[PDB]
Amino acid sequence: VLSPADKTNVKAAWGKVGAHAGEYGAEALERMFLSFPTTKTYFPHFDLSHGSAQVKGHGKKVADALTNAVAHVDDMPNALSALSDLHAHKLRVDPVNFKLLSHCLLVTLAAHLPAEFTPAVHASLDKFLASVSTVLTSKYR
Amino acid sequence: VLSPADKTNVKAAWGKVGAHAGEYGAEALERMFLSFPTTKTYFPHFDLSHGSAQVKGHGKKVADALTNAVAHVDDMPNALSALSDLHAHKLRVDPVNFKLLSHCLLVTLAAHLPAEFTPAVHASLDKFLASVSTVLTSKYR
Amino acid sequence: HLTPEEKSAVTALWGKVNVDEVGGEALGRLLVVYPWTQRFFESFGDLSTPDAVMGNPKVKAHGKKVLGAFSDGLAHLDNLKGTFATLSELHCDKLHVDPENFRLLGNVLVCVLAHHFGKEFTPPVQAAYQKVVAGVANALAH
Amino acid sequence: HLTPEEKSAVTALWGKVNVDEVGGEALGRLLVVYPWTQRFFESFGDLSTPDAVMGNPKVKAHGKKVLGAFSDGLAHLDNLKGTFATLSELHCDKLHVDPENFRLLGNVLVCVLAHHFGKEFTPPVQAAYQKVVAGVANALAH
Numbered sequence: 001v002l003s004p005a006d007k008t009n010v011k012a013a014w015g016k017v018g019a020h021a022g023e024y025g026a027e028a029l030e031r032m033f034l035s036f037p038t039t040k041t042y043f044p045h046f047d048l049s050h051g052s053a054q055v056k057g058h059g060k061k062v063a064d065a066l067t068n069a070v071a072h073v074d075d076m077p078n079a080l081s082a083l084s085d086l087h088a089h090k091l092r093v094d095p096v097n098f099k100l101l102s103h104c105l106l107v108t109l110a111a112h113l114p115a116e117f118t119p120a121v122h123a124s125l126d127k128f129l130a131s132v133s134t135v136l137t138s139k140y141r
Numbered sequence: 142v143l144s145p146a147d148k149t150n151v152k153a154a155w156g157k158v159g160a161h162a163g164e165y166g167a168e169a170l171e172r173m174f175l176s177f178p179t180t181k182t183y184f185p186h187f188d189l190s191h192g193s194a195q196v197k198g199h200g201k202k203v204a205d206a207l208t209n210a211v212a213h214v215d216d217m218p219n220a221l222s223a224l225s226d227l228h229a230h231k232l233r234v235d236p237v238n239f240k241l242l243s244h245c246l247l248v249t250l251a252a253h254l255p256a257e258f259t260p261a262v263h264a265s266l267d268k269f270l271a272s273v274s275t276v277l278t279s280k281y282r
Numbered sequence: 283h284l285t286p287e288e289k290s291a292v293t294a295l296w297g298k299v300n301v302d303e304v305g306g307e308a309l310g311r312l313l314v315v316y317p318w319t320q321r322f323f324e325s326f327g328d329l330s331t332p333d334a335v336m337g338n339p340k341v342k343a344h345g346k347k348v349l350g351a352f353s354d355g356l357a358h359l360d361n362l363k364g365t366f367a368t369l370s371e372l373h374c375d376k377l378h379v380d381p382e383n384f385r386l387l388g389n390v391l392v393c394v395l396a397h398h399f400g401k402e403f404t405p406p407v408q409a410a411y412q413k414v415v416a417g418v419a420n421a422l423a424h
Numbered sequence: 425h426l427t428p429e430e431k432s433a434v435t436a437l438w439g440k441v442n443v444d445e446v447g448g449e450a451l452g453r454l455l456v457v458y459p460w461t462q463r464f465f466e467s468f469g470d471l472s473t474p475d476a477v478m479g480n481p482k483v484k485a486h487g488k489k490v491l492g493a494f495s496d497g498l499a500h501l502d503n504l505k506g507t508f509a510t511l512s513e514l515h516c517d518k519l520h521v522d523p524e525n526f527r528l529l530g531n532v533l534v535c536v537l538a539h540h541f542g543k544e545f546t547p548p549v550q551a552a553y554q555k556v557v558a559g560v561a562n563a564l565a566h
């Protein structure tokens with residue numbers, strides 16, 4: 001569960017990401033595919049090569065979803081309901097893989113926004129991404 | 142996150158535990174100490190021998206807490222707030238250990254209530270105990 | 283790793299396991315309790331409800347094979363790595379099974395033995411089996 | 425495990441790490457992001473706030489020791505088990521550190537290198553370091 005300070009932190013770091021969210025979301029995906037190649041098995045029909053336009057379009061979707069999780073940080077199960085049905089009921093993503101994408105996202109943000117990636121922010125981003133991961137891995141109603 | 146069916150399941154299985162909750166809570170602790178001896182490091186000042194009255198008193202406290210988590214399955218962070226402060230702020234229990242106690246509890250219930258431990262119930266109890274574990278490992282407000 | 287008196291406890295209770303049924307019950311329960319494991323058994327047909335999974339014949343039949351393999355491990359409790367080598371290749375190279383799932387299956391198996399033996403699955407018996415299933419999970423992880 | 429061109433990428437970027445500072449920054453961040461790891465450093469004094477942890481001299485000093493050990497591993501990337509044997513005994517027999525935490529420290533170290541090198545910590549550089557830190561975590565787990 002997030003503290004109130006966690007929420008302020010995430011709202012303000014992700015606010016600074018702004019209009020690079022799409023570009024960071026693509027880079028995080030590309031890090032995940034290179035560093036943990038088993039995650040490519042979920043994307044069998046994609047061009048996964050470097051600079052692929054399909055990975056860059058998927059990174060925009062992932063990022064835009066994270067933007068909405070932030071705007072609804074108090075009621076995430078409800079805001080992320082269709083995503084939860086896609087990842088838990090239809091795709092059946094093993095939960096281990098959410099820890100890999102989350103790590104790749106943190107790494108992308110550290111490399112791009114070093115002045116914002118303080119220890120306190122790092123801690124709050126990590127807890128937010130774990131709470132998003134839990135919503136998406138759960139079959140609920 | 143729990144489904145509505147998860148909640149009905151847990152409410153009805155734990156309702157059947159009833160007045161053996163204390164005895165099951167002691168047995169689960171004793172299973173955990175025998176099967177995973179590193180968990181004894183959190184209890185340095187206890188008699189941990191078989192039949193210890195201190196383990197039997199601790200099992201009643203753990204069980205009575207689970208009874209209250211069930212009665213407040215919709216607002217657990219609020220009902221489990223003091224417990225969360227004890228385990229996450231003061232004792233600093235590594236989260237791995239919540240998976241061990243949870244498993245020992247499932248094993249205790251399987252051995253004692255076989256007719257209630259159907260696959261569906263097993264699944265709902267496991268999700269409830271993971272949600273309790275998450276509340277207790279988190280520093281929040 | 284296992285004392286002579288906990289190797290014996292393990293063998294005694296294992297001689298009483300219904301090898302046609304327990305393996306299926308465990309694999310069944312894995313698919314119901316950890317629903318993403320269903321992704322790996324997509325060819326087995328209907329896995330849509332707990333009832334469907336538990337009565338699916340191909341789950342029953344694969345669970346006999348898996349239990350067969352644990353029994354092989356229980357005969358060779360020293361040389362578990364050598365017992366399970368071919369199976370580690372298969373679960374990684376070909377299936378891509380994350381090794382945390384091997385731990386989940388061993389724990390589910392422990393609960394199924396609890397459920398069948400009841401009072402006789404005592405804390406000391408459980409502790410010997412926890413050493414056995416951790417062993418099998420480690421031997422399988424590549 | 426590491427290709428010759430990813431062993432070289434790793435060594436080049438490592439020759440630029442401030443060995444007085446990065447180790448502390450990583451151990452610091454571990455204690456802030458995963459707060460139960462503070463239980464193992466109870467003698468280090470005040471760990472009460474992120475500011476306190478990051479400025480604590482004994483955290484800074486222990487982080488130099490840990491980084492020292494990773495550098496030892498990076499010199500012996502074949503024979504990591506033999507490099508880390510004594511340290512595996514210490515972290516288990518004496519400290520009781522659950523091995524999942526070894527993985528967390530390696531990942532935090534990856535984020536600290538991302539944070540210091542920025543654009544030059546490219547996806548292929550990160551992937552070589554992920555192989556390196558998994559190696560160290562496996563060598564340490566008993």
Ligand code: HEM
Nearest residue numbers: 039042043061062065066083086091093097098101132133
């Ligand atoms: C924070 C974590 C994640 C978020 C926010 C996220 C978000 C999304 C979104 C927004 C979609 C597209 C849904 C649509 O187009 O309607 C999607 C699809 C998908 N996601 Fe995720 N996702 C996450 C994690 C993961 C992980 C870890 C995996 C696998 C390793 C994964 C695999 C997929 C797959 C395979 C699709 C289907 C894409 C396609 O076939 O076109 N996702 N996700």
Ligand code: HEM
Nearest residue numbers: 180183184202203206207224227232234238239242273274
């Ligand atoms: C469902 C999981 C758990 C529940 C419901 C639970 C509940 C409790 C309760 C009710 C107390 C007593 C608080 C009081 O007396 O005011 C307590 C104390 C304690 N718990 Fe837990 N607990 C859980 C898991 C764990 C785990 C996994 C550990 C360690 C492995 C742990 C270690 C302790 C310790 C060391 C104390 C202090 C006992 C003492 O010094 O007297 N608990 N817990």
Ligand code: HEM
Nearest residue numbers: 319322323347348351352369377379383384387388418419
């Ligand atoms: C932990 C102990 C486990 C053992 C002892 C075990 C044993 C086996 C055995 C004996 C086979 C058959 C190999 C053959 O006939 O050549 C097999 C196949 C397989 N196992 Fe496992 N397994 C284990 C865990 C798992 C887990 C956790 C998963 C997935 C979550 C899994 C997925 C599979 C799959 C997909 C196959 C291929 C099934 C098929 O032929 O369609 N196994 N395993």
Ligand code: HEM
Nearest residue numbers: 461464465489490493494511519521525526529530560561
């Ligand atoms: C993952 C890589 C790690 C490496 C390379 C590493 C390395 C070391 C080294 C070099 C020492 C000093 C040993 C000596 O001076 O004789 C040490 C001590 C220690 N490590 Fe680690 N360590 C790691 C992970 C961890 C983790 C994850 C924890 C706890 C969460 C931990 C807790 C400790 C503690 C408590 C000590 C004793 C500190 C003291 O002297 O007060 N280590 N480690």
